[PDB]
């Protein structure tokens, strides 16, 4: 009825990186959760550093 949008979004926010850093602080990020496709990007440590 009031039609007043409660989501005020600002384009100098990074909601994606705010969620990537939030999952690190609350849980073990190495684990794989398929439902949210929660599988963190991870290079091999012996390929980067020879």
């Amino acid at each position: 009825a009031s039609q007043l949008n409660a989501v005020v979004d600002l384009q100098d926010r990074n909601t994606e990186l705010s969620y990537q850093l939030l999952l690190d602080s609350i849980g073990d990020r190495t684990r794989y959760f398929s439902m949210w496709n929660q599988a963190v990007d991870s290079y091999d440590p012996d390929v980067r550093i020879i």
Binding site: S18, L21, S25, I26
Partner: peptide, 28 residues
């Protein structure tokens, strides 16, 4: 609100009082 709490024995298993809000930020 002891009727909402599980009973470990005959005492209500309550949480702590000051554990209600969050305070975490990106380094702070």
């Amino acid at each position: 609100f002891a009727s909402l709490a599980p009973r470990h024995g005959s005492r209500p298993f309550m949480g702590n009082w000051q554990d209600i809000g969050t305070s975490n930020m990106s380094g702070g």
